[PDB]
Short mmCIF file of C-alpha atoms and ligand atoms in Angstrom, two decimals:
data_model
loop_
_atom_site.label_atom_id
_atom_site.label_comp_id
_atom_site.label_asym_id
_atom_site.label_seq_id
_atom_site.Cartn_x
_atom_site.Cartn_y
_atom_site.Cartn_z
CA UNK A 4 28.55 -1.59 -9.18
CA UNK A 5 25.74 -3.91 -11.51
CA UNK A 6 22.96 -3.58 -10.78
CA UNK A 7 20.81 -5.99 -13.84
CA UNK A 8 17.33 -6.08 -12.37
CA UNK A 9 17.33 -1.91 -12.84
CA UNK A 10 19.59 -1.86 -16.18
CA UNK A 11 18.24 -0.40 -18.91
CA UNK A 12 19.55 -0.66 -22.02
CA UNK A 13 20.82 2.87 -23.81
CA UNK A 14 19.93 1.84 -27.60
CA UNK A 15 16.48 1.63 -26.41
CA UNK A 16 15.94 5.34 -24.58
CA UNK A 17 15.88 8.28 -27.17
CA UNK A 18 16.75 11.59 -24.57
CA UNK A 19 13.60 14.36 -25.75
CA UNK A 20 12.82 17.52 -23.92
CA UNK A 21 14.08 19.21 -21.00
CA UNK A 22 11.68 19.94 -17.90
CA UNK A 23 13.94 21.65 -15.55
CA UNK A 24 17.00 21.10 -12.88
CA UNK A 25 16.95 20.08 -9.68
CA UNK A 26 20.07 20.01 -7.30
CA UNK A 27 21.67 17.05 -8.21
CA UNK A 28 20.58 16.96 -11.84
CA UNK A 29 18.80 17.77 -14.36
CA UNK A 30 15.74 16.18 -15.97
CA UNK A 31 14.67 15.31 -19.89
CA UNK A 32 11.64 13.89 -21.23
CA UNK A 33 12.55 10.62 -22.90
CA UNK A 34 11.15 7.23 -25.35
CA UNK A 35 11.88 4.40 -23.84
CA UNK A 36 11.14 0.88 -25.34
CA UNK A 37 9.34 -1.62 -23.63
CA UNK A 38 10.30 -0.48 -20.37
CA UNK A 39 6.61 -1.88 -20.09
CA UNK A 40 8.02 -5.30 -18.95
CA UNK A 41 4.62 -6.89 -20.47
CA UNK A 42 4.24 -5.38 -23.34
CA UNK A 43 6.73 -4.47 -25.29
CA UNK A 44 7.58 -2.89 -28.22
CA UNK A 45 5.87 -0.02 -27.33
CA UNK A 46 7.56 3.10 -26.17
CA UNK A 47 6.54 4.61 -22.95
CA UNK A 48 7.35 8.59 -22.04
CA UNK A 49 9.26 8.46 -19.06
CA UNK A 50 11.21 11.08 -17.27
CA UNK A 51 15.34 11.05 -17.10
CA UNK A 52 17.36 12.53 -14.44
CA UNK A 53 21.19 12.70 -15.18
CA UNK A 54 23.96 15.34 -14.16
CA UNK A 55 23.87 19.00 -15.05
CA UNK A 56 26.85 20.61 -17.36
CA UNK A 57 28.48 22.06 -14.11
CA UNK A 58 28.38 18.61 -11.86
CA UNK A 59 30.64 17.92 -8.74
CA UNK A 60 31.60 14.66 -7.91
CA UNK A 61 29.50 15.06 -4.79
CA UNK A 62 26.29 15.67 -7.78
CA UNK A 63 27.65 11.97 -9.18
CA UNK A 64 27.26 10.66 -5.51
CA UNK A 65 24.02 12.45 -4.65
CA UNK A 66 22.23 11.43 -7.68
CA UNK A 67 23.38 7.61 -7.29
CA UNK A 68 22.55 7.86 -3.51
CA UNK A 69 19.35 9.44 -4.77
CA UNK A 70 18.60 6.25 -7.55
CA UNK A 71 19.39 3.63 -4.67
CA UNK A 72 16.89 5.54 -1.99
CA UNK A 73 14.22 4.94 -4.49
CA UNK A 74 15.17 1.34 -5.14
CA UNK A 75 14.92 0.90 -1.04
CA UNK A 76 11.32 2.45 -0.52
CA UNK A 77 9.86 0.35 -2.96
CA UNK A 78 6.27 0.97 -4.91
CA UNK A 79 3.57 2.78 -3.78
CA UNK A 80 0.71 4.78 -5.24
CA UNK A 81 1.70 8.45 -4.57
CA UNK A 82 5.38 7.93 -5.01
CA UNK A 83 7.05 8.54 -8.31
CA UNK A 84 8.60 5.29 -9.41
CA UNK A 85 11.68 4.31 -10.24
CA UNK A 86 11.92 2.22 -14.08
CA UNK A 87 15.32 1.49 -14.36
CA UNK A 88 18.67 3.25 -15.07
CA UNK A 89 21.83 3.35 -17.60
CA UNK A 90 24.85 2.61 -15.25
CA UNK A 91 27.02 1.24 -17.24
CA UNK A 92 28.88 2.48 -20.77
CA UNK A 93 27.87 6.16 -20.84
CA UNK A 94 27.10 8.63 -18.17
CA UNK A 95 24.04 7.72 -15.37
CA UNK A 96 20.65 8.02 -16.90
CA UNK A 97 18.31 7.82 -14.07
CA UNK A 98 14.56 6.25 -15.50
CA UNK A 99 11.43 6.93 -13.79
CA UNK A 100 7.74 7.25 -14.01
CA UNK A 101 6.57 10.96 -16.19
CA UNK A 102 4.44 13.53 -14.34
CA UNK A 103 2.94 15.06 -16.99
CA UNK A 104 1.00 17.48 -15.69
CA UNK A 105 3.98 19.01 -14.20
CA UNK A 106 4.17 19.59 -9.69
CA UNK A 107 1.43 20.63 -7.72
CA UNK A 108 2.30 24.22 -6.95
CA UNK A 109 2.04 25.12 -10.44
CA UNK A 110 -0.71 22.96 -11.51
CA UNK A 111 -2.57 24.91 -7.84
CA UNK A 112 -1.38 28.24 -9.93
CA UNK A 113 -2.94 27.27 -13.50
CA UNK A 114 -5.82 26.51 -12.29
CA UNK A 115 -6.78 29.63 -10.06
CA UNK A 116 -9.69 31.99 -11.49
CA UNK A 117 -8.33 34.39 -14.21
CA UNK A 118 -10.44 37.49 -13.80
CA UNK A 119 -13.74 38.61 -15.01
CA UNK A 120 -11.47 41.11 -17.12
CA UNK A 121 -8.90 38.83 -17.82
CA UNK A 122 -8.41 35.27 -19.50
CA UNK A 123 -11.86 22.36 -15.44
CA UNK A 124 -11.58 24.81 -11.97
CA UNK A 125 -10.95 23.00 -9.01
CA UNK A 126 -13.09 22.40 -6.11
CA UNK A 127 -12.58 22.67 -1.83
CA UNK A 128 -12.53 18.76 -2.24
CA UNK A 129 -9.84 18.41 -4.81
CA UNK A 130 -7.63 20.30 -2.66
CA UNK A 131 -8.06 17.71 0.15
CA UNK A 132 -7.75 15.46 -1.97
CA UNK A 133 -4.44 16.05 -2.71
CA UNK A 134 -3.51 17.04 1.06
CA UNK A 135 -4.85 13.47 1.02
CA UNK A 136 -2.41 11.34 -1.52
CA UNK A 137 0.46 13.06 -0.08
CA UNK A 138 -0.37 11.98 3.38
CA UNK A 139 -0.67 8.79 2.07
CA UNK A 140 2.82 8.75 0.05
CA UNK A 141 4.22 10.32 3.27
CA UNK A 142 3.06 7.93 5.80
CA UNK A 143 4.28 4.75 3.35
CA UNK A 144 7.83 6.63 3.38
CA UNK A 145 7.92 6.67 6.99
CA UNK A 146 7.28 3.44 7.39
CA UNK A 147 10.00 2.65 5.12
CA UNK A 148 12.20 4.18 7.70
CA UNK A 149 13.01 7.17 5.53
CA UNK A 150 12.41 10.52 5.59
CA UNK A 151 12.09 13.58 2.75
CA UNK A 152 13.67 16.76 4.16
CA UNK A 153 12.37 18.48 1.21
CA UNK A 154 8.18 18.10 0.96
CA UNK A 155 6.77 21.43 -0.46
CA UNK A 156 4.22 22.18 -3.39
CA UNK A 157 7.28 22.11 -6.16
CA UNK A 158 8.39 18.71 -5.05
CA UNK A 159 4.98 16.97 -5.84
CA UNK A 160 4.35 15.66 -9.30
CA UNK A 161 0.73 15.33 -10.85
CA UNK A 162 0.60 12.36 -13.40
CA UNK A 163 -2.36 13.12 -16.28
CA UNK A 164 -4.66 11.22 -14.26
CA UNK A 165 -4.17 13.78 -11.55
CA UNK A 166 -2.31 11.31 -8.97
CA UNK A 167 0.09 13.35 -6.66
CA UNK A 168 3.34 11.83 -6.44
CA UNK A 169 6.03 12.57 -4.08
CA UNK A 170 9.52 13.31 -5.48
CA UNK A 171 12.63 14.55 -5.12
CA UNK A 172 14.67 12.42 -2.75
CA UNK A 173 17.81 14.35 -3.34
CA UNK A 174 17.40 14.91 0.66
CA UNK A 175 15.96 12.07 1.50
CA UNK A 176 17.83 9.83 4.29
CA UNK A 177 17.73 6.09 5.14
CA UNK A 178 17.00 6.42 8.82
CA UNK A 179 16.54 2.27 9.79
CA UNK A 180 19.28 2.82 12.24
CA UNK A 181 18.39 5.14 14.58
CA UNK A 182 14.98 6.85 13.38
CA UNK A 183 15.98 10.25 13.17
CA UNK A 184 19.31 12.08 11.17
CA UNK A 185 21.32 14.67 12.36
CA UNK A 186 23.03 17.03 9.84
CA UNK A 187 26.13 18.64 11.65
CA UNK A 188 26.63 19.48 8.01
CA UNK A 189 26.48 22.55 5.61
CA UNK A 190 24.62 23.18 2.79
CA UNK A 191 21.71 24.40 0.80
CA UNK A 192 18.20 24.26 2.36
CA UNK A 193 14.27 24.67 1.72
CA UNK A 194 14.49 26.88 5.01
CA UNK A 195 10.89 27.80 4.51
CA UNK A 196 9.35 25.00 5.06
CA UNK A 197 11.75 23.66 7.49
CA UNK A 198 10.46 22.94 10.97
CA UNK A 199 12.90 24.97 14.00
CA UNK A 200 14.54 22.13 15.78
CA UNK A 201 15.51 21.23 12.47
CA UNK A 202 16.60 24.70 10.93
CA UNK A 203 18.01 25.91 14.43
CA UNK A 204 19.35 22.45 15.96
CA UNK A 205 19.71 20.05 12.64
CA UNK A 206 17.49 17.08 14.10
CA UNK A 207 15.61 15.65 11.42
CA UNK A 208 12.66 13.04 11.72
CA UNK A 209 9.09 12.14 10.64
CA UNK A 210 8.16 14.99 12.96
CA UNK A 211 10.14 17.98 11.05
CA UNK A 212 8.49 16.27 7.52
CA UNK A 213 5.20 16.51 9.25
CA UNK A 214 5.72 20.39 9.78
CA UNK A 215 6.83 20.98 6.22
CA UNK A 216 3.54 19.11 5.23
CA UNK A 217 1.57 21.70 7.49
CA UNK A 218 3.48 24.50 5.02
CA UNK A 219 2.42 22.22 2.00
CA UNK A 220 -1.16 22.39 3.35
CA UNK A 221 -0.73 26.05 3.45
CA UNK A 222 0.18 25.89 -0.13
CA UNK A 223 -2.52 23.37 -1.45
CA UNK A 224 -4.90 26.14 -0.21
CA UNK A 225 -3.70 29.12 -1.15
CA UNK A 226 -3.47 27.50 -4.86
CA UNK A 227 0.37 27.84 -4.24
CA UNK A 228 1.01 30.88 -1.99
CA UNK A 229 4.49 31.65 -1.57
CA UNK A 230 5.03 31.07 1.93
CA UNK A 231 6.53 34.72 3.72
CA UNK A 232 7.00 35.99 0.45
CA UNK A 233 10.15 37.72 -0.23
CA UNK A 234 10.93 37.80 3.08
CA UNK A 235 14.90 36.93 3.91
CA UNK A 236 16.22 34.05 5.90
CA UNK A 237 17.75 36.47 8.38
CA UNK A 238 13.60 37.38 9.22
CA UNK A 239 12.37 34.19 8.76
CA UNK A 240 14.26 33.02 11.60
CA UNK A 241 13.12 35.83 13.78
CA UNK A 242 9.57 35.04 12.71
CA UNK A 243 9.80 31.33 13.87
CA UNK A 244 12.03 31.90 17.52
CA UNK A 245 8.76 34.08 18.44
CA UNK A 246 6.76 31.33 17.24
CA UNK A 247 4.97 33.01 14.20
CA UNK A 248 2.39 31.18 12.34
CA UNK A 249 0.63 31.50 8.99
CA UNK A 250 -2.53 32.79 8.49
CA UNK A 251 -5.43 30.40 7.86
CA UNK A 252 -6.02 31.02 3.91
CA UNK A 253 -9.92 32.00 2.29
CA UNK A 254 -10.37 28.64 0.79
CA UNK A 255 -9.47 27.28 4.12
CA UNK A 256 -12.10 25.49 6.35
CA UNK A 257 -11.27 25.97 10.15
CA UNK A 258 -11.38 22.30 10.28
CA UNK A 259 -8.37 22.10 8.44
CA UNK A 260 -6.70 25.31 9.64
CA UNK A 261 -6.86 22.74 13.13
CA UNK A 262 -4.59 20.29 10.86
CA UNK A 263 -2.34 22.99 9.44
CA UNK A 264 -1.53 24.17 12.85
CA UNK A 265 -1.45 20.64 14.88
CA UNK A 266 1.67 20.51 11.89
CA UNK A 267 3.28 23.40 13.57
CA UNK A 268 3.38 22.58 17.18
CA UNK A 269 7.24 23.54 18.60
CA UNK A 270 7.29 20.05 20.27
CA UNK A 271 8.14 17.63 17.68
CA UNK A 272 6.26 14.70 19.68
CA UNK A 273 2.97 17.44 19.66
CA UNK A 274 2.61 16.75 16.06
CA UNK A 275 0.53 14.24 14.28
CA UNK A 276 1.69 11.39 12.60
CA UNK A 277 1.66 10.85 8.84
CA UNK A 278 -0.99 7.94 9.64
CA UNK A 279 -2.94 10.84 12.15
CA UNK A 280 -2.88 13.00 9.28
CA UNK A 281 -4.17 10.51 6.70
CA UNK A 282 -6.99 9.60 9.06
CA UNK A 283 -8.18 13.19 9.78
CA UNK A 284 -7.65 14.14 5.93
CA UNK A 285 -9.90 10.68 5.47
CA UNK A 286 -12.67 12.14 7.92
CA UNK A 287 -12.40 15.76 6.17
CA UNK A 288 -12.81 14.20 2.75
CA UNK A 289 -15.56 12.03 4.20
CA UNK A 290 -18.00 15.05 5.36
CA UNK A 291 -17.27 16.90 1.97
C1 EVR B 20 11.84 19.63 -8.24
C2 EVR B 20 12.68 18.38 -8.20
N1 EVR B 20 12.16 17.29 -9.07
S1 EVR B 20 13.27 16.83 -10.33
O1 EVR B 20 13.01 15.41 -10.57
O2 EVR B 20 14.59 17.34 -10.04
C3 EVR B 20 12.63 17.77 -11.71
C4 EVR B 20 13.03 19.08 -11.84
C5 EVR B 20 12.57 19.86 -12.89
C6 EVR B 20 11.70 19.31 -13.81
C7 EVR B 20 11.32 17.98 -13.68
C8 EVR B 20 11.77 17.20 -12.63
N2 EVR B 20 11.40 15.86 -12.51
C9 EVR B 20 10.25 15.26 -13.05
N3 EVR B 20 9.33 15.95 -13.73
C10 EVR B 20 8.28 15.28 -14.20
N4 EVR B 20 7.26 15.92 -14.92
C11 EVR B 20 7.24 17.29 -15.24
C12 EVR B 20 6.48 17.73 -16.32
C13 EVR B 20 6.42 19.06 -16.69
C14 EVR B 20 7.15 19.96 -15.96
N5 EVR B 20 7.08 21.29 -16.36
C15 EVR B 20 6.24 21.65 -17.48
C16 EVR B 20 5.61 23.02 -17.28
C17 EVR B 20 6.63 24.11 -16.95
N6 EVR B 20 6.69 25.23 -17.95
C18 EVR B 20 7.75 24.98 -18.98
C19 EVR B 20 8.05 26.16 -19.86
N7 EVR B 20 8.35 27.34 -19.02
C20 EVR B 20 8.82 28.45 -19.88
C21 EVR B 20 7.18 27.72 -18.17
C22 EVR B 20 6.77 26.56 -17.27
C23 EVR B 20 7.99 23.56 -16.54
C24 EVR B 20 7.86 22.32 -15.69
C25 EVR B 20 7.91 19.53 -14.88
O3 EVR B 20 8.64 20.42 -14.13
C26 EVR B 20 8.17 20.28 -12.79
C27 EVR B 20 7.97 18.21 -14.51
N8 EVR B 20 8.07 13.98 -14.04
C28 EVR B 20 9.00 13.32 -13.35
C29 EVR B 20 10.11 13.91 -12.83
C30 EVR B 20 11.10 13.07 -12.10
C31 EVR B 20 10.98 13.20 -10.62
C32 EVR B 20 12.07 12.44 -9.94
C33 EVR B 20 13.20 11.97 -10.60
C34 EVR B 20 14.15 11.27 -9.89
O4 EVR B 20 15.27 10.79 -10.57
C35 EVR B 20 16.23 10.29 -9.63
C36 EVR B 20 13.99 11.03 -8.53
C37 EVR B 20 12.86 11.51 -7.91
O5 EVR B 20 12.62 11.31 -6.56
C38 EVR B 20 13.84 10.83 -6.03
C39 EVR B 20 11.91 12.21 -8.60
#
C-alpha cells in the first residue's frame, strides 16, 4: 500500500557501503538528497535496510512490519529514526537515521585499554551515561505500548555525537491491545539475554525487556563482556532454572550492581520499571 508522507524518491538515494546483516535484512550506507526536508540539495548519509540475497517472503513481511513499527513509535532522542522508504517501483529500501560510530558493544570494545605492551578512554560516568539514554529510549517505547524483545549491547547504535540509539525492531511487537505478547511460536532467539518466563513460558512484556536491560548493564560495564561465554543453550537454561546470576563486573559500583540485579528478579512484577530505572540511573549520574 502508499504510503506518500514516508516515500522517498529512488533517483535521489545513491546505495554506498555495506555495514552488516541483520535478520530480516541487510544494511548499506547510502546519499540521499534532501531528505533534510529544510534544506535541500544537500545529501545526507543515511543508513538503508533492504532484503538479503537469500530472503523469504516471511523476510519481505518482517522487514515491512519492521518499517511500520517505527512509523508507530514516533520520534524520540535515543531511538534511531525512521527518514523515509522506496515502496514503490523497485525492491523496499528502508531509510533511516546513520550511526556512525557503529553499536555500543563494539564501540565498549574499541575503547578498552590496549596494554602497556601493546597498542579518548572512557570514564565510570560515560558508562552510566549510556545505561542512561537507553533507559530513556526504553521507557518512551513502553509507553508507546511496544516492546523490543531484542535489547543487548549489538542492538544499540552510537551516532558521532555519541547519542545511544535503540534499534533493531525486527522483534519488536505492537502490544496496545493487551500489554503483553505471547509467542506460542518458533524461531530464532537472543536466548542470552532473555528473561525465564519468557525463554521457558513465551510471555513477553516491559518486564522481560527490563531483564535483558539488566544483561545490557552487564555489558556496558564489562566494556562488552560476552555474557556466559561459549557456554550452550542446553547450560544456559540449567544456569537460569537454579536461578544463576552474573557476577558484579570491576568497573562496577555496588550501587549499580543493586540495579543490575533488581533487573533480574524471577517475578516479573519485582522488577523496576523503565521510568524506575531512568530515575535511579538519574540519581547515579547525579552523585558522579
Ligand atoms: C544489529 C541489527 N541492526 S541492523 O539495522 O540490522 C544493522 C546490522 C548491521 C549493520 C548495520 C545495521 N544497521 C545500522 N547501522 C548503522 N551504523 C553502523 C555503522 C558502522 C557499523 N560497523 C562499522 C564497524 C564494523 N567493522 C567493519 C569492518 N569489519 C571487518 C570489522 C568491524 C562493522 C559495523 C555498523 O554495524 C553495527 C552500523 N546505523 C544505522 C543502522 C540502521 C538501524 C536500523 C535500521 C532499521 O531499518 C528498518 C530499523 C531499525 O530499528 C527498527 C534500526
Amino acid at each position: 500500500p502508499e504510503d506518500p508522507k514516508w516515500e522517498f524518491p529512488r533517483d535521489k538515494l545513491t546505495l554506498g557501503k555495506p555495514l552488516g546483516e541483520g535478520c530480516f535484512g541487510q544494511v548499506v550506507m547510502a546519499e540521499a538528497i534532501g531528505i533534510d526536508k529544510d534544506r535541500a540539495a544537500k545529501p545526507v548519509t543515511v543508513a538503508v535496510k533492504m532484503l538479503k540475497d537469500d530472503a523469504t517472503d516471511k523476510d519481505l513481511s518482517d522487514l515491512v512490519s519492521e518499517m511500520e513499527m517505527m512509523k508507530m513509535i514516533g520520534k524520540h532522542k535515543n531511538i534511531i529514526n525512521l527518514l523515509g522508504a522506496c515502496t514503490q517501483g523497485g525492491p523496499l529500501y528502508v531509510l533511516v537515521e546513520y550511526a556512525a560510530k557503529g553499536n555500543l558493544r563494539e564501540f565498549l570494545r574499541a575503547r578498552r585499554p590496549p596494554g602497556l605492551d601493546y597498542s579518548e578512554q572512557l570514564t565510570f560516568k560515560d558508562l552510566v551515561s549510556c545505561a542512561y539514554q537507553v533507559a530513556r529510549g526504553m521507557e518512551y517505547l513502553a509507553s508507546q505500548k511496544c516492546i523490543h524483545r531484542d535489547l543487548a549491547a549489538r542492538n544499540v547504535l552510537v551516532t558521532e555525537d555519541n547519542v545511544m540509539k535503540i534499534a533493531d525492531f525486527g522483534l519488536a511487537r505492537d502490544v496496545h491491545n493487551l500489554d503483553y505478547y505471547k509467542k506460542t511460536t518458533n524461531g530464532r532467539l537472543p536466548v542470552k539475554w532473555m528473561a525465564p518466563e519468557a525463554l521457558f513460558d513465551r510471555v513477553y512484556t516491559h518486564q522481560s525487556d527490563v531483564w535483558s536491560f539488566g544483561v545490557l548493564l552487564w555489558e556496558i560495564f564489562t566494556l562488552g563482556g560476552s555474557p556466559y561465554p561459549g557456554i550452550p543453550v542446553e547450560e544456559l537454561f540449567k544456569l537460569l532454572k537454579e536461578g544463576h546470576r552474573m557476577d558484579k563486573p570491576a568497573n562496577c559500583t555496588h550501587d549499580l550492581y543493586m540495579i543490575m540485579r533488581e533487573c533480574w528478579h524471577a517475578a516479573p512484577s519485582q522488577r523496576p520499571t523503565f521510568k524506575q530505572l531512568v530515575e535511579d540511573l538519574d540519581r547515579v549520574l547525579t552523585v558522579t
